[PDB]
Structures are given as C-alpha cells and as structure tokens.
C-alpha cells in the first residue's frame, strides 16, 4: 500500500512529468547542436552565434511571457506550452531532414540563398522551441511547486532539491544516448527517432498534468481573477527593481558571467591542452556527484541554520575554491602564463560547482516564498532575462579575444564578478538579520 501510495500521490506524477520534459528537451537540443555543426563545420564561432541569438531573444520575450503566464488560467497555460514546444520540435526536424536529403540541390535549385534561408529558419524554430520550454519550466516549477507543497517549508525544499538532482542526472545521461542513436545509422533516422519520442512524451505529459490538477483542488483558485509590449517590459522591470528581495535576485545574475563555469572551459582547454579521451568522462562524473552533494548540503544547512546563513556559507565555499583556481593560473609552471595546473583549475571549478548549487537553491527558495502570488510570473521572467543577459556578456567576452593571455584575463574578470555578486548578497543579508549576521547556533 505504501508503494502504491507513493506511485499515485501528487509529488511523484509531477516528478515524472518534469523528468520526461527535461529528457526530451535536452536530447533535442544536443541533436540540433550536432546537426548544424556537421552542416557548416566551423566550431566555436557558430556555437557562440547560436547561443547569442537564443539569449538575446529570450531576454526580451520572457519579459512579456511572464506577464502572459500570471494573468491567465494554469491548466490552459501548461497545455498551450506543451503543444507549442512539441509542434516546434516536429517542424524543425522536418526542415533539417529536408535540407540533409538535398543539400546541393537547394544550394542551386533557384539561388544560393536557399541554404542560408533554411539555416535561419532552423535557428528561428529552434529558438521558438526554447521560448516554449522556458515558459513551461517557469509556470510548472514556480507556481505548481509552490501550491502543491502546501504550507510545509521542508516539503518545498525537498521538492526543489529533487527537481535539481533529476536535472543533473538527465544532463549527464542524455548526450550519451543521443550519441549511441545518431552513431547507429544515417542522421535522417536519429532525427526521426527523437521527433517520435517528443510526440509520445507530449501526450503522456498532458495526461499526467491533467491527473495532478485533479488531486490538488487549491490549484483552481487564482487570486486576482476571482506599444503594449514596451509598457509590459517597463512595468515588469520597475516592479523587479522595487521588490524588497532585489539585491538577492541580482546576486544570482552576476554569477552567470564566468568562464570558470563548466562546459565552455572544459571543451576549450581540453581541446587546446589535454584531449586524452577518458579523463572527460571522469570529469563529467565528478561534476554530477558534486552537484548532488551541493543539493544535500543545501537541505541540511537550511534545516539547521536557516536560509540567509545558508547563502552566506555557500558563498564563502565558492569564493575559497575560486581563489584556489586563481593561485593555479598565476603559477610560474605556466598553464598558458600571463599538469599540476590543469588539475588545480578543474578542482577549483568542481568545488565551486558545489557552492554554486547550494547558493542557487537558496535564492530560488527565497524567491518562491517571499513574492506575492499575483507577481509569480513577472519577477521570474525578469530574473531569467537578466541571467541570460549576463550569459550574453560572457559570450561577448569569449568571442572577443581567443588568445591565452586573454584566457588569463577572463579568469580574473570572472572571479571579480562572482565576488561582486556575493558582496551584494551580503548587503541584502545585513539589511535583514542585522548585527546577528554570524552566530549560526541559535
């Protein structure tokens, strides 16, 4: 009965839906990345262009997407989001398979611009898919995790942590599956498989969400119901500016500007120095494990010493491991100048990942619990927009100077920005638990 109890319940169905959504949307993302690379071939520059376009679009559009979410009905919003995202995936896949079948034929069928037109259409549709995914993630996580968790702060925390663990495991195990499939036949078949997976996943997820709605009756009472884009943008941004939790929300955003974060740094440096071929799997495993300890440490610290003090401790940890990284880069051993050094750098990045995940969970919970219900849309959309604005600045920094001394200067600047973010969070903390900021023991 207990096993049957959980299997039905109201948390497990939400977990299942989130897992399916993330799995589909990451397999498709990596498949899109590989296909475009195969088509053009120019690495680094094109990936950065794609990321820049994505971030620039999502900033502006999510600013309005939050408003559209907060002033409609929940079930309708979720259903619309799922439908849009999956239809977008199907159409983009159809076009990609078409251009693969007749590359040179489209290149000269009428003009040389057919190929570029198809390329920009692919970019546009893959973008629309990302907007839909952002919208559904916002609404599902924020609104439904807040309402289904009830009044128990402990249950809210456990649920946030479980979502983040599901996300890290899905990242580490998804690329691998995409690879095995894509490398077991002509590309046209991998695309087909991914599209079919997405469609069946959409149907099952709609059914699961309807079922969840039927078990939480408090999900139907929305307080508030019972040219214009510029106005919405301005109102959203000023509302974000005037919120009592502003300095906290900005503190997270400054953490996104960093070359010290994974993915970019690992690919770049390993390609320049240390390809190996087996160390990268170990690094992926280490990153996953440390993310998991970050989540569990967040839970324990929140239970023991409260929220704000959890943030301060997480910040201390991340800053210490990044000082280890800076000592590493300045060594006369010369990683690139300005084997021990790369190890030190990766260790710094990993422990910084621990601290970063703890801090992110803290800030997310603060947002969830201290924001008035009617704005559970505007504020979150604006925060996403700002995070991706800093990510765009990071991309500008990466593309500007690709030299080794440039990499050293980038490390220093990223550490500086992390420090400024943590200083703003410290000011927010002092403005709350004034004087007694220390003394973890109550």
């Amino acid at each position: 009965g207990s096993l049957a109890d959980y299997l039905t319940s109201a948390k497990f169905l939400l977990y299942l839906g989130h897992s399916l959504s993330t799995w589909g949307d990451r397999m498709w993302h990596f498949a899109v990345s590989v296909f475009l690379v195969e088509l053009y071939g120019n690495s680094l520059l094109l990936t950065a262009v794609y990321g820049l376009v994505v971030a620039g679009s999502v900033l502006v559009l999510g600013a309005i997407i939050g408003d559209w979410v907060d002033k409609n009905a929940r079930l309708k919003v979720a259903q619309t989001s799922l439908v849009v995202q999956n239809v977008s995936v199907i159409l983009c896949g159809i076009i990609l398979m078409m251009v693969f079948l007749h590359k040179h034929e489209l290149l000269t069928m009428y003009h040389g611009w057919v190929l570029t037109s198809c390329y920009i259409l692919i970019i546009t549709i893959a973008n629309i898919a990302n907007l839909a995914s952002t919208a559904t993630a916002i609404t599902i996580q924020r609104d439904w995790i807040v309402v289904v968790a009830g009044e128990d702060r402990s249950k809210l925390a456990n649920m946030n942590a479980t979502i983040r663990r599901i996300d890290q495991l899905t990242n580490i195990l998804a690329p691998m599956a995409v690879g095995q499939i894509m490398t077991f036949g002509s590309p046209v078949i991998g695309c087909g498989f991914i599209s079919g997976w997405n469609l069946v996943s959409m149907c099952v997820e709609y059914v699961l969400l309807w079922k969840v709605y039927q078990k939480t009756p408090a999900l139907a009472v929305k307080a508030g119901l019972k040219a214009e884009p510029f106005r919405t943008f301005r109102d959203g941004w000023v509302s974000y500016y005037n919120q009592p939790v502003f300095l906290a929300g900005m503190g997270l955003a400054f953490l996104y500007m960093t070359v010290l974060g994974f993915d970019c740094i690992t690919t770049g440096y390993a390609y320049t120095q240390g390809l190996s071929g087996s160390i990268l799997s170990i690094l992926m495993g280490a990153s996953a494990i440390t993310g998991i300890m970050g989540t569990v440490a967040f839970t324990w610290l929140r239970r023991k010493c409260g929220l704000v003090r959890t943030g301060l401790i997480s910040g201390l940890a991340q800053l210490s491991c990044l000082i280890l990284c800076v000592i590493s880069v300045f060594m006369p051993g010369s990683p690139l100048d300005l084997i021990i050094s790369v190890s030190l750098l990766f260790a710094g990045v990993i422990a910084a990942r621990i601290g970063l995940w703890s801090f992110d969970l803290t800030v997310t919970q603060l947002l969830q619990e201290n924001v008035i219900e009617s704005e559970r849309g505007i504020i979150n959309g604006v925060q996403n927009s700002m995070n991706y604005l800093l990510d765009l600045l990071h991309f500008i920094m990466v593309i500007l100077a690709p030299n080794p001394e440039a990499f050293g200067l980038l490390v220093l600047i990223s550490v500086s920005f992390v420090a400024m973010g943590h200083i703003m969070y410290f000011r927010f903390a002092q403005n709350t638990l004034g004087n007694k900021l220390f003394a973890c023991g109550p």
Partner: antibody
Amino acid sequence: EVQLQQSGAELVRPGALVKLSCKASGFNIKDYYMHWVKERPEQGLEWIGWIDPENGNTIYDPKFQGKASITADTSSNTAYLQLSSLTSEDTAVYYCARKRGYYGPYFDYWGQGTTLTVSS
Amino acid sequence: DIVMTQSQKFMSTSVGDRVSITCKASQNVGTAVAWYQKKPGQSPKLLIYSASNRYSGVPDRFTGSGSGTDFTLTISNMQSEDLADYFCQQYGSYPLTFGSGTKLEIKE
C-alpha cells in the same frame, strides 16, 4: 477558522518578571513567523521582534534588545514573551501577530491584546 | 531606520463623501506599504497590501494609490461604521516602523 488566544489583565510591581502567552489554534505554529507588537496609550504601534519556531532564531528591535525575549514551543503550539526590569513606562497593550515569510506583505491574523499595568 | 509620518491627525468628514489619508515616507521604500483599520478595544485588521491590492472580504469603497515616497488611501461614500483608526506600515527593511495613525470624526 484560525485564531490566537492570549492571557490578559496583568498587574505587575516594577522590576518584577512577567510572561505573556499566545496559543494558536487551527494551524501549525512552526509554519509561520510569530511577531510581537506593543501599543502604548495614545501612541503609535511599535515592533518588538519575531521568532522562527522551527529553529528558534530571534530578531529584536535595537531599542528593545536588552529587556525583551521571545520563546516558542511547537509541541504545545504556543509562544511566550519575556519582559525584564519593568518600569512604570511599560504599561501598555501587547499583540501577537502571524506572518508568512521574511518580507511577508501583511499580518493576516492578530490576537485579542493583553493589558499589562506596572502599578505600585 | 525609516521613519513614517502622517501629517494630518483628524479628518472632519460628513457621510457619503470621499476622503484621502496621506502617508509619506522618509526614504524610497518602493511599493511595500500596507494599511490597517482598528476600532477602540479591538484588534487591527487588513485593508490593503502592496498599496494597490485589496484583501478578500473588504468592501470595494476602499482604494489604495501612490508609489515611491507618497501614498494615499481613498474612501468613497463612507458610512457610519468607517469611523475608526487608520495607519500605514512599511516592510521594505527592518526594523518595521508603524505610522502615527489618523482618526476620523463627523461634521456638525
């Protein structure tokens, strides 16, 4: 339905020790923040402090730090206020309040008020 | 700390008119302002939070407005049971400070 009950009609000699009870019914105390508020005769309201029943953290006002304590008990679902070194000034009406988060928009429910008189 | 001031203490009003209570802060607090009503020998109750939003169950004649530094509470067509005490509270930063409060009366 939600309500909070307080003891009342307290007469105290100056310099003594006194406790004020706040019993909550209809909800778990550990899920909210408990605030204590003072009202002087023909004077504005003043904020004393708050407590988190989950872990027992207490923040007070700087002008009230030396002579005010707040305790909570989740097993009996109650809160207590401790005042020390009372003078004739301290006679007032004290209120119990419930808040959602750190920066909650409002107090939704209040006690009935307790009258404390320092007499001789 | 942030000091909150209400300039006028007494509103001499007749029935059915519109009145405006003013609350002016000493710092740019933003939007984090709430209003309360209390009667003699009673406990204060919510009227408006975040300076614009009303609380479920409150009558519609109560409206809130203002932003940044100045805030106002507008009463339309008040009747014989709105004769009470009103004050404004902020929650932008700690410690929390309450307004001095304003009381209403009647004309004769």
